[PDB]
Amino acid sequence: MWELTILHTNDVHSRLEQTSEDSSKCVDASRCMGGVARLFTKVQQIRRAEPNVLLLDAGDQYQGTIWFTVYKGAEVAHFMNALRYDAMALGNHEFDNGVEGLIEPLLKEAKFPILSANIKAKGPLASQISGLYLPYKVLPVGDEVVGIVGYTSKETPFLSNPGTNLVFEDEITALQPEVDKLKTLNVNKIIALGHSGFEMDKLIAQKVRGVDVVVGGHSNTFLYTGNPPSKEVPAGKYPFIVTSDDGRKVPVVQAYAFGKYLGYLKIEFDERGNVISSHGNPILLDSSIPEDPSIKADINKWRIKLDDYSTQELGKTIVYLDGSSQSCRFRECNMGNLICDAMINNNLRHADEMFWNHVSMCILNGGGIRSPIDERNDGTITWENLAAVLPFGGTFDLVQLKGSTLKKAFEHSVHRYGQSTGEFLQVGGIHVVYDLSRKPGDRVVKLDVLCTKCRVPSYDPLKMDEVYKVILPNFLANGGDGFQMIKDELLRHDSGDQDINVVSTYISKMKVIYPAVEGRIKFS
Amino acid sequence: MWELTILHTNDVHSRLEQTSEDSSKCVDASRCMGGVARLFTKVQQIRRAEPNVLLLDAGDQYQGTIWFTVYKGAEVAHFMNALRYDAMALGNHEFDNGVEGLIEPLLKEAKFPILSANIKAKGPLASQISGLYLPYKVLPVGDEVVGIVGYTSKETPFLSNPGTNLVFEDEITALQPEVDKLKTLNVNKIIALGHSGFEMDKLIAQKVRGVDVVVGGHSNTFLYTGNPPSKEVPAGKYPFIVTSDDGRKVPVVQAYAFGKYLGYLKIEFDERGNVISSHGNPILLDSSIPEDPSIKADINKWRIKLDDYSTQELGKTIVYLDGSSQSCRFRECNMGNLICDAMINNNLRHADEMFWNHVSMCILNGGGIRSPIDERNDGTITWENLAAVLPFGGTFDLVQLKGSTLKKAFEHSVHRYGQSTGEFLQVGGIHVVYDLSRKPGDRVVKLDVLCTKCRVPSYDPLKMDEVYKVILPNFLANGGDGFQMIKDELLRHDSGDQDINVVSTYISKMKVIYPAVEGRIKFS
């Protein structure tokens, strides 16, 4: 039998350094997790112990801390090379700085193949980018060869900045003839590695004949067999087994996000490449694993340039600033309240003619909030802390909407509630109540809004046929996260200030902050 | 028949200048009201027209604007003398600066008699204060004589600073032998003039044999016959007729507060002093009455010293700051929210050890909020604006209370709801719901409070047997407004910063404020 060890990461999102266990900045060093130094130690240990090992990344290394703000992906190429990754698939965040921001820092510097079979280049772009990413790579592993075929979320154009000259084809349609090619080349072991989300991963496993294993990402899925070692709750066993339409058992794996875990799957193949068995579990990268001293020293080197985003205290928090996805995608979270209060404040700083100009209302996609902040380091808030919460460089815009437009937005907010999706709205100037037992599109059972046409602001039931001034991310003003109604029906859009500056100025002005969860969003 | 015209004011509370119609600072001059210049014009007009006129004040001239903060009652004596008042009764606020603060600025300078029959001086004080206020005064009016007997709220010791050497006797008990004396002196026309509240006024009219008319104050009662001319809603006709136990019809009058109206009652007497008939109505002192130019010039003179409390803008509001009694004694008012938010802020500026130190909760007697602020003057907030909202020089203290102590405080808050009484609580860190259809002591149907023993603050049901850190006025920490439970049961009291400084520093820090009514207090 020939045994393959697959070690995999996904949605690392610029956590080059170890982190608190909620993936924010490490403060209590003795209990930190993740980071590429600790990852290295563990991979090294596994490579000593197992003869056939591949280390794979399923995309979304780009975007998430000051590391990326500053080094713009040059840190990704540098440290992925140091860890000796064997292959990476392109994720949507790889395109955030446009194709140019992927070509120059990453594709031209990586020492391993970068993959995606469903991304097709056209127009003036097709010539530059040719050869820089590949549909697949066949890799020698010991005496054998393993084919890796890449794929990338078909909805990257609605998520990132890939430009007008790249086409994202259906993953299953694009993947099949590549896997078919590999088979005619007599490659009988085939891993599909890519970045479309666990639901698409399962369908690729089901539908692409010849795929032996799927290694995926994008949905930050945590899978586990046995008693999970930390706060993440398993969505299924590890590996998750899909039975293909031609009858094969196909393991499907993902390993959460932020470099907190290393996925580890061992696959037993026979000499024809049939999977006899597989097993494993993600490995929690906690402090019981030591940080490699070489990689850590090189991280400390690179870190020097990052220190002046932590040089100044902006303000303090005396409460935990809960920007976790498990809160912000599911209920009112105090990081979302703080941000909306800054957006409204920033506006109502230049307002009042009367009953108009006053904008009283804010909404904010909870998935746009990308990290918590911890109150325990004497509670200091720095530019670096804020940059991990708001890494996209968006702006907070003013939009005018109808009551009816807004009610449909709130129905959209919870239309598929329960899947940790980013559309769930955090708010200010708005008291919404949902009843999730009702049907999608009919779950909003109360929606009050803060009058602006009044001398004392108080909450009144929203009116379907009235018009309202809402502050919200440009992401949302453009129909991001499926808020088609907003793009389609707004009656006015104006651009606003940079997101991080807004929140930063607000914090500096308050000096000490303490946002509560206060019943702006309730469930019936 | 001999016809007497009684012109009366009560609870003027240092509104020497004309005011907006909500009794705050005059900004729109063409629509201002009240003030002693306008009052003078009207009284002058009446004195030309009627031969037998008395101008009477039923107490509480002291305390309410920068006028009093600064001139400490010397302005009261000066302008009451200019208006030629015939008599004043002592009210509770006359004692706010202690007996010394009444003796020196007012009792020694007034050109008219100052009255109270139920205030008895004892100890070392009895000798100083003798002769400076009187139980009654007989006044020549044309060819006749009218006896005026004074009275003062028996609860002045729980309201003001009268010291340990003055006794406040039952008003009816003290009044009867004085009225009896006047009768044996053949005074057959007798006005009881005093400051105990409309309910006590009615009982004096009922029970003190020989009183022909009661002129009162303290409860700011507005009475009117016909269609009221402004926003105040009549509590009864003017005069309000009480039938005495010996069968006489006794008119009882009051004229709201803040010098907005001049009470005007004409009484027809026969030659034995029987009241044949009476009628009148309070006169709204609006801009249709011109300000007397002499008095106005002398007001402008005195005003010069007040100008440097308006020299600096503290901050702006872009909302009306509703500190009216009709709001703050009856529902959540945004001036009460602003004040509690300043109290909590001022504390949580020097806080965090963890789950303790953090004080999350504030309560505030709505009657301690003594004026609104208008947003229309480009919304400027000055020291003078704030001084009329918080004129008492109190402090905001920290107290530790049991859940059970707090629940009884909230029941106390609404135990006699509906009478514009000052105990109704404004709050922060607290979401209370009342059901006024339930019995007194059982009207609180929800009471949630902001955790402090948690890393993210959120609202949880109060627990009867838990302990809570509450910021509140010292007035309340001492059992003011009938909050006996608080004084009696608190488990810790510490003194805090001056009230006006707290709110002022808060406003200066926010720069621009916009407090909403947001459902901290709801009714079921």
Ligand SMILES: Nc1ncnc2c1ncn2[C@@H]1O[C@H](COP(=O)(O)CP(=O)(O)O)[C@@H](O)[C@H]1O
């Ligand atoms: N450019 C952008 N601006 C604002 N929010 C964004 C964004 N890109 C992604 N998001 C938010 O993040 C959510 C998706 O984050 P996930 O972690 O589940 C997948 P990924 O963004 O890392 O590709 C989106 O639903 C949206 O709410």
Ligand SMILES: Nc1ncnc2c1ncn2[C@@H]1O[C@H](COP(=O)(O)CP(=O)(O)O)[C@@H](O)[C@H]1O
């Ligand atoms: N020294 C003090 N400190 C704080 N609040 C006071 C106060 N004196 C009076 N109040 C508040 O004002 C309410 C009474 O005001 P009213 O206008 O009805 C009668 P008056 O205070 O002018 O004598 C009290 O119930 C209390 O809430």
Ligand SMILES: [Ca+2]
């Ligand atoms: Ca195979």
Ligand SMILES: [Ca+2]
């Ligand atoms: Ca009589």
Ligand SMILES: [Cl-]
């Ligand atoms: Cl998915």
Ligand SMILES: [Cl-]
């Ligand atoms: Cl009364």
Ligand SMILES: [Zn+2]
């Ligand atoms: Zn991601």
Ligand SMILES: [Zn+2]
């Ligand atoms: Zn992604």
Ligand SMILES: [Zn+2]
């Ligand atoms: Zn008064």
Ligand SMILES: [Zn+2]
């Ligand atoms: Zn009074």
